[PDB]
Design a protein around this ligand. Structure first.
Ligand code: GDP
Ligand code: MG
Ligand code: ZN
Ligand code: ZN
Lengths: 407, 137
């Protein structure tokens, strides 16, 4: 196999305790071409940052760097992981609930110089709790800003905050993303906790396309210059160069009905994963598939939201949708935004499932259940969680989530 | 040391914690490292700030680094270009050492140490206590 990323670690915590700083600090050195080190995403404004967890052969300490930060000797590769960072308390929230099938663990960053449970910090623990993500590591950051008295008071606070949650058994590592205090302890913990799960590669392939492009540019060679390319997170089984795949919703056609997407099939030419090209890619990090498809079809990220797999074995496409609605008890925001009024018949909601994003029209009401017609067909497996977001002014606010039921 | 013994973890976390910030005598104006790894080169564009905060020369530090590290760099308009790839902490760890053996007085900790030269020998030091440690290490 490859030294590609083996697990997706989510960076969650308040919007200022330092999630983005710690990420860059650990991933900076693993970004060489066409990506200066850090940026947020598409509709799930999700961002993937790779990092190679290594062990210093001389001092025996862990880091995310090739040359031991301390002694200076060469480190050894142990594993490759990928952090999912995202500026925007909402976007992260939406991503987590919707594509919970992407994360394998999460690092809860909680600033030590502020009351433990901050409005936003609660919502993530709330999201992590809803998607059954128990593999959590707590990073009490900015330890250099609180004397040992406050630190212990914070520690305690955190402990009371997590008891009775999925992060109830998570370590509380005091660190300094700024100076690097205990980063070695942390990195090591990512191995102790959040290990690569046992996945049966033989399961039929499924990838959630996060982006689609046309790497073509007036470079002009007309020969075998690459066709359509998709970037996503394999979430089941595996993709292999030379594989015949079936894209999901598909390409639209000329109004017989009004709008209709037909599933399309293509052949995988290339696969980038870990910065290099492989003949076989696996879940963990981002995967860049090369197809024989007309770039004219993937250009501008039109394919984004689709799912890939082997012809025949894919999820069921939907044109309508009923859901087991579960409104959330949100704390971040303003009282108005806060107490969500229940969804209404005819309201236009914003839906998130997998990497697909679409508007839906409430055409029915029941007891903690609703119906919706989709603006864009979405490929989904029943039972999968769908993020539901209502407008509220000019913005879109996440008010809850629904559970895919059959109609 | 297990991850559940927060206490030890806390003290382990404060030794790495810098001088100026770690203990009693605190030069406190040292702003942390700002590292940008572009293409195949590391650039700390916050350099001037560091030196000017440590009241040390600009090139006196460019050197201490290329020493503890094995790359080549040039200073320019308050920034520095390093020839390879280096994580913010690698550098973060080297500045820590500089402050320790080139900016602090070992008898009476004082950010007020200064580089002096009274012979071809570099004895540099203290404007507060007067101790003149021989620093080339
Ligand atoms: N003193 C100190 N500041 C930090 C540390 N980690 C992050 N910060 C600062 O906290 C602020 C940023 O947190 P940031 O990266 O913006 O947080 P985010 O909002 O969750 O994306 C910045 O000013 C950081 O440089 C740390 O370990 N020590
Ligand atoms: Mg951010
Ligand atoms: Zn070492
Ligand atoms: Zn002195």
């Amino acid at each position: 196999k490859t030294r590609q990323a083996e697990v997706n670690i989510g960076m969650v915590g308040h919007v200022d305790h330092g999630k983005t700083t710690l990420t860059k600090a650990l991933t900076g050195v693993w970004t060489d071409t066409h990506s200066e080190e850090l940026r947020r995403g598409i509709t799930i404004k999700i961002g993937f940052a790779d990092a190679e967890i290594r062990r210093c052969s001389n001092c025996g300490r862990y880091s995310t760097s090739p040359i031991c930060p301390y002694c200076g000797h060469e480190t050894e590769f142990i594993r490759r992981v990928s952090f999912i960072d995202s500026p925007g308390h909402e976007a992260l929230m939406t991503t987590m609930l919707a594509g919970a099938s992407l994360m394998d663990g999460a690092i809860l960053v909680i600033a030590a110089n502020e009351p433990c449970p901050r409005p936003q910090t609660r919502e993530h623990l709330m999201a992590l709790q809803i998607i059954g993500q128990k593999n959590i590591i707590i990073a009490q950051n900015k330890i250099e800003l609180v004397d040992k008295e406050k630190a212990l008071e914070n520690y305690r606070q955190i402990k009371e905050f997590i008891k009775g949650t999925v992060a109830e058994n998570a370590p509380i590592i005091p660190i300094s993303a700024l100076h690097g205090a205990n980063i070695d302890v942390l990195v090591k913990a990512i191995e102790e906790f959040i290990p690569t799960p046992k996945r049966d590669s033989n399961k039929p392939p499924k990838m959630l396309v996060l982006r689609s492009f046309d790497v073509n540019k007036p470079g002009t060679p007309p020969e075998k210059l690459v066709g359509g390319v998709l970037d996503g997170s394999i979430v089941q089984g595996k993709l292999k160069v030379g594989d015949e795949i079936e894209i999901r919703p598909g390409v639209p056609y000329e109004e017989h009905g009004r709008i209709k997407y037909e599933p399309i099939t293509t052949e995988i030419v290339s696969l980038q994963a870990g910065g290099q090209f492989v003949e076989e890619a696996y879940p963990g990090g981002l995967v860049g598939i090369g197809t024989k498809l007309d770039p004219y079809l993937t250009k501008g990220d039109l394919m984004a939201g689709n799912v890939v797999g082997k012809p025949g074995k894919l999820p069921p496409v939907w044109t309508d949708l009923r859901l087991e609605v579960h409104l959330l008890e949100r704390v971040v925001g303003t009282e108005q935004e806060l107490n969500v009024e229940p969804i209404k018949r005819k309201e236009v909601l914003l839906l998130n499932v997998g990497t697909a994003r679409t508007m839906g029209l409430v055409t029915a009401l029941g007891k903690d259940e609703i119906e919706l017609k989709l603006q864009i067909p979405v490929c989904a497996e029943p039972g999968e969680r769908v993020a539901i977001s209502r407008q509220i002014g000019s913005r879109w606010r996440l008010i809850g989530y629904g559970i895919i039921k059959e109609l | 040391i297990d991850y559940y013994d927060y206490e030890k973890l806390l003290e382990k976390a404060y030794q790495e914690l810098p001088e100026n910030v770690k203990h009693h005598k605190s030069r406190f104006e040292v702003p942390g490292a700002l590292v940008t790894i572009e293409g195949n080169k590391t650039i700390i564009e916050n350099f001037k700030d560091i030196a000017d905060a440590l009241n040390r020369d600009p090139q006196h530090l460019l050197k201490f680094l290329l020493r503890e590290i094995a790359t080549a760099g040039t200073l320019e308009g308050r920034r520095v270009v390093l020839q390879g790839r280096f994580t913010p902490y690698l550098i973060a760890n080297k500045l820590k050492k500089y402050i320790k053996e080139y900016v602090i007085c070992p008898v009476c900790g004082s950010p007020d140490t200064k580089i002096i030269k009274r012979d071809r020998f570099h004895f540099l030091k203290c404007e507060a206590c007067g101790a003149e440690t021989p620093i080339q290490h």
